[PDB]
Design a protein around this ligand. Structure first.
Ligand SMILES: CC(=O)N[C@@H]1[C@@H](O[C@@H]2O[C@H](CO)[C@H](O)[C@H](O)[C@H]2O)[C@@H](O)[C@@H](CO)O[C@@H]1O
Ligand SMILES: CC(=O)N[C@@H]1[C@@H](O[C@@H]2O[C@H](CO)[C@H](O)[C@H](O)[C@H]2O)[C@@H](O)[C@@H](CO)O[C@@H]1O
Ligand SMILES: CC(=O)N[C@@H]1[C@@H](O[C@@H]2O[C@H](CO)[C@H](O)[C@H](O)[C@H]2O)[C@@H](O)[C@@H](CO)O[C@@H]1O
Ligand SMILES: CC(=O)N[C@@H]1[C@@H](O[C@@H]2O[C@H](CO)[C@H](O)[C@H](O)[C@H]2O)[C@@H](O)[C@@H](CO)O[C@@H]1O
Lengths: 14, 133, 133, 133, 16, 16, 15, 133
C-alpha cells in the first residue's frame, strides 16, 4: 500500500 | 457516537476540549503542526451543550506532551472518557473533568503524539493516539 | 531498586516472570526475536525470593502482544507493579500477581513491543516498553 | 537556487514537473496525500521559462513509487538534476529531461517517499526525499 | 546527531 | 501481518 | 528532544 | 550467488570487506551495534580467493556513515558491485575495488544505516541497506 503507517496506541474509553 | 480520525502530523500546537463535571468530555479539536504550518483539525463536537471550554496552548516546538492521562466511566449507560490531563515538559494541563472511574495513563519516554482518532456522541466515547519519533 | 534496559529488538518470542500473590511481580526476563532468531535477554532478578515462575511462550511471528495491562500499588511503603496481564491476538496470559491498586492499560492498534526497561528491587518498581512498526 | 522543503506527508498522489530537452528539469510540484485527502504542495518554479510540462497521476493508494532515478550533469557551469524517472509498482514514468551526465538511483525495498525538498534556480539544483514506513 | 538508532518508548508505569 | 518489526530498506544496487 | 516529528531523509542529489 | 540478510541493529561499529583491484568486491561482513554492545554479523564470503582485505573501524557512536557510493558493472558476464566508498562525518573510506561501470550514491541527510542484505557469488552481486531513525 501507498499509505504511510504510524504507531497507534489505544483505544481508551468504550 | 460519530467516529473520527485526524491522522498523523508533524506535532501538536493546541488542544481544544470541553467538559462537564457531571458527565464527561464534550469537545475535542486539535491544531496540529504540519511541516511548520499550523493545521486546524476537524472540530469533533458533542451532540449536546453545557460544557466548560478549555484551550491548551503549547509553546511549540520546545513544549510537547510527555503524558496523556485520564479516567473512563459510565455516564447515562455509556462508557466514555470522563477526564483528561496533559503533562508537558513545562507544566500540567488539567485534570479537565472529574477524576473518577478507571484511571488510564500514557507516559512517554521517547517519541511524540502526532495525531488523534476516536468517537464522539453525547461525550468522547474513546480515543487513540498516533505516536512517532 | 536496580534499573535495567534490554534495548530494542525485532519482536517477542517468550516472557519469563515471577510473582507473589500477596506482594507484586519479582523477576522479569524476555526471550526476544533478533532478525528471525531468538535472543535470550538478561534475567532481571528480585533481591528477595519466594516467587511463583511463569513462562509465556509465544507462537512468534503469528502471535504478538496487543495489550499489556496491570496494577500499580504500595507494598512495604514502595510503589511497585503489583500485577501484569499480556493479551496477544491469540490469548490472555494473566493476571499474575495482585489485582489491587491503580490499574494501567496499553492497547496497541498498530505497531509492536520490541523491548523492555525498568527497575527491580524486592519487586518490579516500574517498566517501560519500546514500540516499533 | 531557491531552496524548498515540502516536509512530510502520508504518500504521493501526483507529481507535476517540467523539463527542457536541451537543459534540465525546471518546475516541481507534488499533490501529496495527507491523512486520506489530497494536499496540493507549493509550486516550485524555475527562474526561467520554455519548459515542457508533465503530470504524473498515480492510482493512489494501490500505485506507489518503488524507484526514483535520473541524471546530474553540468548545464551552463552548474551541476543540476538534468533528468528524472519515477518507477511505480504499475508503470515507469520517464525519463524526463536530458539523460546525460552522472546517474543516481533510489530503489525502495520497503517504505515510501512521503516528501520532497531541494533547490531550484534556473533548473532543479538538487533534491532529497523523506522516507517513511 | 549520534550513531545510535532510537525507538518510541512508552512508560514508565509504577514508582515515579 | 506478523509480530516481526519492520524497517525502511533501500536498494538493491548491483545485479537484479 | 523537541516537539517536531522526524523522518528518514535520503539525498541530496545534484549541486 | 549466495543471498544474505543480517537484518536490523542499533548501529554500525565496523565493516570488514575484501576487493581485487582487477575485478570487484569479494567478502563482506559487519560488526554492528546492538543496544550498546558489539554484535559480530555473519561472515559473507566470496567463492574465490585473491582479494585485498580491509578493516573499516568506526569511532562509534560519534562517527557514522553519511553516504555509501560505488560502482556496479559487468565482471565475467555477471552484474556485480565493483567498488564501494563509505563517507562518514569524520572520514572518507575508499574507494575499494574497480571505479568503473555505473555509479550509485546513497547520501543520508537524516537517519542511520542499521543493517545490510545482499548476495555473494564470486563477487558482491548486489546489496541493500536498512535505514532507521
Ligand atoms: C446517536 C448516536 O450516535 N448515539 C451516541 C452513542 O453511540 C453509541 O455508543 C456505543 C458505545 O458502546 C456504541 O458504539 C454504539 O454503536 C453507538 O451508536 C454514544 O456515543 C453516546 C455517548 O457518548 O452518545 C450518543 O447517544
Ligand atoms: C537500592 C536497593 O536495592 N533498594 C531497593 C529499593 O529502591 C529504592 O526505591 C525507591 C522508590 O521509592 C527509590 O527509588 C530509592 O532511590 C531506591 O533506592 C526499593 O526498590 C525496594 C522495594 O522495591 O527494595 C530494594 O532493595
Ligand atoms: C541567485 C541564484 O541562486 N542563482 C542560481 C544558481 O545558484 C547557485 O548555485 C550554485 C550551485 O552549487 C551554488 O549553490 C550557489 O550558492 C547558488 O547561488 C543556480 O541554482 C542556477 C542553476 O539552476 O540558477 C540560478 O542562476
Ligand atoms: C552458485 C551461484 O549462485 N553461482 C554464482 C553466480 O550466481 C548466479 O548469478 C545470477 C546473476 O544474474 C543469478 O542470480 C543466478 O541465480 C545465480 O546462480 C554469480 O553470482 C557469480 C558472480 O558473482 O558467481 C557464482 O558463479
Amino acid at each position: 500500500s501507498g499509505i504511510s503507517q504510524t504507531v497507534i496506541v489505544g483505544p481508551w474509553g468504550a | 457516537g460519530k467516529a473520527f480520525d485526524d491522522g498523523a502530523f508533524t506535532g501538536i500546537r493546541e488542544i481544544n476540549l470541553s467538559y462537564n463535571k457531571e458527565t464527561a468530555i464534550g469537545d475535542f479539536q486539535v491544531v496540529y503542526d504540519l511541516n511548520g504550518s499550523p493545521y486546524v483539525g476537524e472540530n469533533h463536537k458533542s451532540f449536546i451543550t453545557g460544557f466548560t471550554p478549555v484551550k491548551i496552548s503549547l509553546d511549540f516546538p520546545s513544549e510537547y506532551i510527555m503524558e496523556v492521562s485520564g479516567y473512563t466511566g459510565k455516564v447515562s449507560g455509556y462508557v466514555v472518557v470522563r477526564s483528561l490531563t496533559f503533562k508537558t515538559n513545562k507544566k500540567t494541563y488539567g485534570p479537565y473533568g472529574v477524576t473518577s472511574g478507571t484511571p488510564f495513563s500514557l507516559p512517554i519516554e521517547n517519541g511524540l503524539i502526532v495525531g488523534f482518532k476516536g468517537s464522539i456522541g453525547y461525550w468522547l466515547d474513546y480515543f487513540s493516539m498516533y505516536l512517532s519519533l
